[PDB]
Amino acid sequence: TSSGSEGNVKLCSLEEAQRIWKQKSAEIYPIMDKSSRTRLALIICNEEFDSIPRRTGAEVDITGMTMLLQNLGYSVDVKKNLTASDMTTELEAFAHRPEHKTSDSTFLVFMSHGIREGICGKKHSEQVPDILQLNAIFNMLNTKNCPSLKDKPKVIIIQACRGDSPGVVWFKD
Amino acid sequence: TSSGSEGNVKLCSLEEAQRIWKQKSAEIYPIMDKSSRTRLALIICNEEFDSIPRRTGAEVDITGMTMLLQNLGYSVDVKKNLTASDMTTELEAFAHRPEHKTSDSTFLVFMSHGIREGICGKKHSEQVPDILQLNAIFNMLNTKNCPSLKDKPKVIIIQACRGDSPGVVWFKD
Amino acid sequence: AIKKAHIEKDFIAFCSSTPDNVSWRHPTMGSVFIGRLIEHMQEYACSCDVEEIFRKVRFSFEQPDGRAQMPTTERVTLTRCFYLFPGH
Amino acid sequence: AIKKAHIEKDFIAFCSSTPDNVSWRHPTMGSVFIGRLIEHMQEYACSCDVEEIFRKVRFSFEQPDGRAQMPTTERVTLTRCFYLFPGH
Ligand SMILES: *CC(=O)[C@H](CC(=O)O)NC(=O)[C@@H](CCCCNS(=O)(=O)c1ccc(O)c(C(=O)O)c1)c1ccccc1
Ligand SMILES: *CC(=O)[C@H](CC(=O)O)NC(=O)[C@@H](CCCCNS(=O)(=O)c1ccc(O)c(C(=O)O)c1)c1ccccc1
């Protein structure tokens, strides 16, 4: 049933979990006790921009991702329409959350306009760029700047363009 | 025995190959007939440099990688002590090789000094940089610039520094 | 006592397209990469590690139409398989 | 007739360290990343796809000593598992 906390996410049975723990040895990330763990996730989604077109349909993405991450057991913080500076501040605040200490993993989701150099903040234009680099996200979440997530999987998801090109070439059959 | 073409590489038995073809469906890259396929690999290794220290021990890496790629069924081209411009010329020539048409995959191996921006050519110094970007390697081997390797796995291996930092942080137990 | 740890480890990034290239979004249906990721997570989180799931998402984009894109896994320092174990 | 194809697909890059960081080499023993990669390829090419092998190489570097480094998988657009099938 989809009426449980996991919603539409297919469950892993106890026999399935033991099979995975047998097909692979000690090459799996340890999972913390469900009763005590405090899993955290962060979604940053920019929809309304100063200069670039409105990201109509972003609400569908926010809804889908928020519900999915909750289904997977994460408490989801949703932040909207931020500049690159605001995103950095939010990421720094996320790295400082005490719940990471009693968590086994994290998810970071970024949804915005994007260019080759990175992700667009709400104030972005060609004249005055407002960009958050992927490099900066990693730096802010690494062992130096986020020791609480040491040895723990950190999944970063980015919905954004990475340039102007259509990403295709022609060939004849 | 290590006396065969595959040397020290553990062989995949016919039962093992069928098990892999059963545990995964049509989510495996197709392999071409061994009798007719013309697999190619390229190793670029810079050992002697104009300004930066000699990469002593590179010969061990060249030997090891060359033999391994041959064991795996690839004809290996080894190019040594090239500038970034020379590397680009060699990569372009490699992309033009007709054998790729009758190949199912390729390996590219780069071994040199490196900085954050990329791989050092033989003429590299801080005053006049001689750098090949990883981005350029991808571009030269993609579907546009290397249509012969369309749909075929292209494995790029880079032995090089990516900066000056030791890559470590301290924590207390 | 103090001990050394890798400064960067246990990361995986998943981007909606390849470098230089566009990613698509529908005004009512949302972003295809996001929608595709949710569907695959829902289906495969029980049986596949996240890296495997991301590959499957990539595979679903393999046949290019008018709105073509190729999601890309980036800067991976996962040393182990990350299984979500949904329900546990 | 002409057909569209993804400009960038079926790539995997494997780097000797993480961005910003050094990679090690021994004057007589060679580069540890290279040596480690060969050993793992020799052992696991028969049973594991290249992505799995690269992860295993990463795992072998997990415990940091005086010469610490963390090999990184980069810009992956493999849509399928790449098995080497050694011997075939
Ligand atoms: C480039 C970028 O950062 C954002 C990423 C994001 O918002 O998630 N991508 C886009 O803005 C792309 C989507 C534009 C919305 C168009 N969708 S549509 O179905 O309404 C539409 C409208 C008109 C058309 O002609 C088409 C069509 O089929 O061509 C579709 C994006 C994609 C390519 C170029 C620019 C922007
Ligand atoms: C930075 C770079 O591009 C190259 C990559 C490569 O050549 O593959 N990396 C290096 O040059 C690193 C290795 C230097 C060789 C030192 N090896 S050693 O065993 O002989 C040695 C000598 C003296 C020492 O003090 C040590 C030691 O244990 O510290 C070892 C490299 C690594 C770090 C910094 C600079 C260069």
List keywords for this structure.
heterotetramer; A: 173 residues; alpha/beta; Rossmann fold; three-stranded antiparallel β-sheet; 4 helices; C: 88 residues; alpha+beta; Alpha-Beta Plaits; two-stranded antiparallel sheet; two-stranded antiparallel ribbon; 2 helices; 5 strands; 27% helix; 19% strand; binds ligand 5PH
What would your notes on this structure say?
Chains C, D: This is Caspase-1 subunit p10. Chains C, D: Heterotetramer that consists of two anti-parallel arranged heterodimers, each one formed by a 20 kDa (Caspase-1 subunit p20) and a 10 kDa (Caspase-1 subunit p10) subunit. Chains C, D: It comes from Homo sapiens. The complex is a heterotetramer, with two copies of chain A (173 residues) and two copies of chain C (88 residues). Chain A is of the alpha/beta class and 173 residues long. Chain A has a single domain, classed as Rossmann fold. Chain A contains four helices and eight strands. Chain A has helices at 14-23, 58-71, 84-95, 134-141, and strands at 40-45, 75-80, 106-111, 114-115, 118-120, 131-132, 154-159, 168-172. Chain A has a four-stranded parallel sheet with strand order 2-1-3-7, sandwiched between helices. In chain A, strands 4-5-6 form a three-stranded antiparallel sheet. In chain A, strand 4 (114-115) and strand 5 form a beta hairpin. In chain A, helix 3 runs parallel beside helix 4 (134-141). Chain A is globular, with a radius of gyration of 19 Å. Chain C has 88 residues and is an alpha+beta fold. Chain C has a single domain (1-88), classed as Caspase-like (Alpha-Beta Plaits, 2-Layer Sandwich). In chain C, strand 3 and strand 4 (30-31) form a beta hairpin. Chain C starts with a strand and ends in a 14-residue tail after the last strand. Chains in contact: A-B, A-C, A-D, B-C, B-D, C-D. Strand 7 of chain B pairs parallel with strand 2 (11-15) of chain D, so a sheet runs across the interface. The structure holds the ligand *CC(=O)[C@H](CC(=O)O)NC(=O)[C@@H](CCCCNS(=O)(=O)c1ccc(O)c(C(=O)O)c1)c1ccccc1 (2 copies). One copy of the ligand *CC(=O)[C@H](CC(=O)O)NC(=O)[C@@H](CCCCNS(=O)(=O)c1ccc(O)c(C(=O)O)c1)c1ccccc1 sits between chains D (22-27, 31, 66-67) and B (55, 113-114, 159-161). One copy of the ligand *CC(=O)[C@H](CC(=O)O)NC(=O)[C@@H](CCCCNS(=O)(=O)c1ccc(O)c(C(=O)O)c1)c1ccccc1 sits between chains C (22-27, 31, 66-67) and A (55, 113-114, 159-161).
